[PDB]
């Protein structure tokens, strides 16, 4: 009863953050009709969360070492819960932007500490292997359960959708309080100069990337904010050399296989993120299931992924992470190919749409566990903080980058086959068929990116003794 | 009975050609002990057969039209059969070389006509699909049965090995005589100047490549012969513009998907060729099975190959060649990955060495049939001759090229891990472990080549209406 309570508490922020993002996206169209925030404000509610979530993410990595990882986890989750309540009672656009800024700060504080708690709370061995599976298992639960909740309690009001996090947030705080123990180690002085430059460099980069399309890539404020990011980034590296308790220990990333493992997650995260966002759009637009039905139809993915994580936790003590990652990705590669050849509009559900999802889910579940274990292997307690933060940012950073390329490919072929750029509802059913074949074509590009991840995963070379089995 | 006799007769030369090459390589060591032809003579017996087999191949494409395909086939097999008897009673080195040269001339005339008879004898539809399966099926039966025969009666004398072709050749001549019909059409005059230059251009290039390693790549005769090959090639193309009944119709090869198809066969043949040669060497040297046991152990591959060919023949009329080629290659890709990870020395036979061979066999069987059908699609009768000849040359030419790269990689890593270059009988059993890991490392390189074939097979774009089902 103490072990199940501990694992659930550590992964709580993963469930909340993933679920919040899915619920926010689903409710965007209805927020217009009530607040009337125009198209410009449509994207600000989304970028507002990401502006502070990514800008302050590396600050939260080192924050646990100077304050305490348990007291940082509770504070991060508590602030996130309070922000949801405020977000649900926003009377104008202004209140909603500040409400979303607060959520990003709360997620930035807690998300890196959640992964760092896995390494320190559980000793290396079977305990850590099971904890990692539960950590990754409920990241997918939040995504699917968001679709069900967001698509169900949205025909009454969008405000109630944001209130669903309060019952969940309260439980995780209670479990974390009554299941986690505070380590008795002396606190470490925070890196002042290195931290401010890192926060200023990351936030400026995200602002310029987000505002670029709105104002144009060469507007003047886009590259104008890009200049600050480069100046901030440059200064950050120089003062890191003579930094005590470094925010980013660059010396820790040498020509060894640490770069390979951290490069795989960056591109692997991009493949995963672009795969869910495209599949979600395809189901809603081309097949027209709607939000509630799509969420219920993806329940087998969670069950299928649960099997993959459960099996991989046992095998990770006997096979190296190299073979498991390749073995898991081999099943996923077959799933994408089948969906790229026999996935036209009008097919039934159980024969055609369920099987590739189930097989794809098992393949992903098998490969997630070995990668996470090797990312936090052979670090220690005085550098697990920053290393955990770097692992998650690369996973999050790879999402938008790969997705941008895929969406560009989708649009280009839509016009080639005969198509129109705009809302799907105004389509003559011959332009729609072009959109259907554009999405199927894009699935080949995602598969191509998966091959690169597999190829670069052959260089990892970790043995099962190091990552686990101790 | 009539149909069965026709398909067997047409594919006869594939069985003989593949069996003869496998038997010759096995009996090379003893030909030294009796004839005493020295190390220099070791390669002339092999290169003699390939010098004329590749030199005269393009002349045999257009021979069928000027005299007749049935008569050309019988003449080609007959001269091959007579040469084997003369090869079996060679007095010394000299008599053996002319014995091997004659076999190459006979196989050059009959092999291109064998594939042409498939297109012109069976109308497009289920008949052709079945005929294509048998044509590719007996290529593997000859390969495996060569090892058994070459390892079974090699302990008494190498002269009995070459006489095994005589009983098989005599049956195939009888079947072709009483099962194939002579076509009643007017003959087309043979291209004198174009044919002569092509034989000179191709023969000189093969000679230069073969003798280069012996005398060095910059000896003077190596590049000296290469100049003659280049001079012949340019003269061949210039005259070929104003040629009647052209030997090589370049105009037939345009930017359409014929180049993509013919490019895949060139590289696909290399992957297939390098896979059997390397696997045979690994089995004999590392596992120490011996020739007879290796031949008997590869029987499941033939049965697995037969199942893949049979299934693909039925599916080719419902699914395009693009998906079948990818589907078959996907199974093979998994088989080679498994071998690259769990194929150390001393593993048992049934669980480890059989299953990857069986799975790989089905993958290859599925992919060859769609590729063969698409290679002879949309051609006609007045140009089937040269097109079939080009298909075989590209398949055979891709073998040595890809194999040379793979062998260099295996040799380089053997020294890296600690080993020696030389006979495998004088290794320390620590130097042999390095060789074992080198072979499995090379298998990944073959997988890299296989991926490129799949990537370039996505551009085929033939519908099932064109290649079959008509
Ligand atoms: C990486 C390790 C790092 C460790 C560093 C530390 C961190 C460790 C944890 C990592 C967690 C990653 C796993 C989570 C996966 C995310 C996806 C998910 O949990 O949820 C499922 C999602 C449903 O979508 P959602 O509802 O989430 O969408 C939201 C929209 O925003 C709403 O609109 O996707 C899928 O089902 C995946 C199926 C894939 C199978 C292959 C496809 C076959 C083809 C079928 C036809 C499709 C058309 C063709 C193709 C176009
Ligand atoms: C494309 C056509 C276009 C149309 C053009 C028209 C023409 C069409 C013809 C197409 C030809 C294809 C069929 C014939 C294939 C021939 C291969 C064969 O039927 O024969 C078995 C062979 C063994 O070779 P042999 O014994 O014959 O060689 C003897 C040496 O010569 C002695 O010196 O291959 C295999 O076993 C297959 C292996 C597949 C699975 C992958 C391996 C898994 C790992 C296992 C452990 C190995 C060690 C690790 C790896 C190192
Ligand atoms: C006529 C149709 C059927 C052909 C369409 C398929 C090919 C043109 C696709 C198949 C695989 C694709 C490749 C698959 C993967 C990649 C990885 C991708 O690599 C990345 O750098 C990821 C993006 C990034 O993070 O920058 C670049 C494109 C490329 C080479 C793709 C190029 C286009 C290819 C060859
Ligand atoms: C050191 C260990 C732990 C890693 C294994 C080495 C990998 C880094 C190798 C294995 C697969 C290799 C690739 C496999 C295949 C190719 C195709 C190869 O292209 C050809 O095969 C051309 C053949 C021809 O001449 O026609 C070029 C190298 C490349 C990219 C290889 C690059 C190096 C890779 C990734
Ligand atoms: C050269 C080579 C042998 C490539 C391997 C590719 C692969 O499948 N590579 C792979 C392996 C794992 C993951 C993954 N999937 C989800 C989450 C995290 N990682 C991914 Br995208 N791709 C294939 C099976 C073709
Ligand atoms: C980009 C992409 C989707 C690649 C496909 C590769 C493939 O598997 N490609 C392939 C397909 C067929 C054959 C074959 N095999 C034997 C005889 C004839 N053809 C071969 Br070598 N490779 C994989 C399954 C990774």
Broad CATH class of the largest domain in chain A: Mainly Alpha
Number of domains of chain A: 2
Please, how many helices of chain A?
20
Strand percent estimate of chain A? under 5%
Question: How would you sum up the global shape of chain A?
Answer: globular
Largest sheet of chain A: none
Determine the structural class of chain A based on helices, strands and strand pairing: mainly alpha
- State the oligomer: homodimer
DSSP helix fraction of chain A: over 70%
| Helix-strand pattern of chain A | HHHHHHHHHHHHHHHHHHHH
Structure summary, number of beta strands of chain A: 0
User: What would you give as the CATH superfamily of the largest domain in chain A?
Assistant: MFS general substrate transporter like domains
SSE blueprint:
Two copies of one chain form a homodimer.
Chain A: H1 2-10, H2 12-26, H3 28-35, H4 38-55, H5 57-67, H6 69-87, H7 93-121, H8 126-152, H9 159-163, H10 165-177, H11 192-215, H12 222-241, H13 258-287, H14 291-297, H15 299-315, H16 321-339, H17 350-375, H18 384-416, H19 431-456, H20 464-467
The structure holds ligand A1H2V (2 copies), cholesterol hemisuccinate (2 copies) and ligand A1AQR (2 copies).
